[PDB]
Amino acid sequence: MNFPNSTNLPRNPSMADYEARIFTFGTWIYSVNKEQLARAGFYALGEGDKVKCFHCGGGLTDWKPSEDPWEQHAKWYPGCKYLLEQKGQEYINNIHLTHSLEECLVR
Numbered sequence: 001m002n003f004p005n006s007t008n009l010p011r012n013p014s015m016a017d018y019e020a021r022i023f024t025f026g027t028w029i030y031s032v033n034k035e036q037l038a039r040a041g042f043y044a045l046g047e048g049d050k051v052k053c054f055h056c057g058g059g060l061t062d063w064k065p066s067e068d069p070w071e072q073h074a075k076w077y078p079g080c081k082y083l084l085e086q087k088g089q090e091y092i093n094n095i096h097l098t099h100s101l102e103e104c105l106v107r
């Protein structure tokens with residue numbers, strides 16, 4: 001799927017600005033909020049609700065209403081330096097602990 005970028009350098013520097021990312025969405029009908037997505041580092045690919053992080057390059061798709069941009073970012077791309085910068089490690093840990101412990105109660 002292409003390896004995640006874990007350096008301090010963004011994979012897509014043209015999408016480093018909040019403003020730049022916001023334009024990629026256009027009119028956006030999806031359950032998940034475009035400004036929250038842009039804030040969490042994501043820009044739209046024009047492939048349904050598929051987004052990529054400007055920094056790690058990590059892709060996310062098929063957004064349910066209960067799925068948070070930042071939480072998903074941490075879930076699937078925990079090495080992302082943008083994520084670490086914006087949210088910090090104690091946020092990242094709680095959210096991993098949370099999804100792991102969720103992946104117990106159902107079974």
Ligand SMILES: C[C@@H]1CN(CC(=O)N2CC(C)(C)c3ccc(Cl)cc32)CC[NH2+]1
Pocket residue numbers: 001050059060061062063064067072076
């Ligand atoms: C918002 C959530 C995202 N979920 C995971 C997802 O969408 N993944 C995780 C994976 C690393 C396999 C991946 C690779 C490329 C793309 Cl484009 C997406 C995804 C699915 C439910 N909705």
Ligand SMILES: [Zn+2]
Pocket residue numbers: 041053054055056057058073077080081082083
């Ligand atoms: Zn990222």
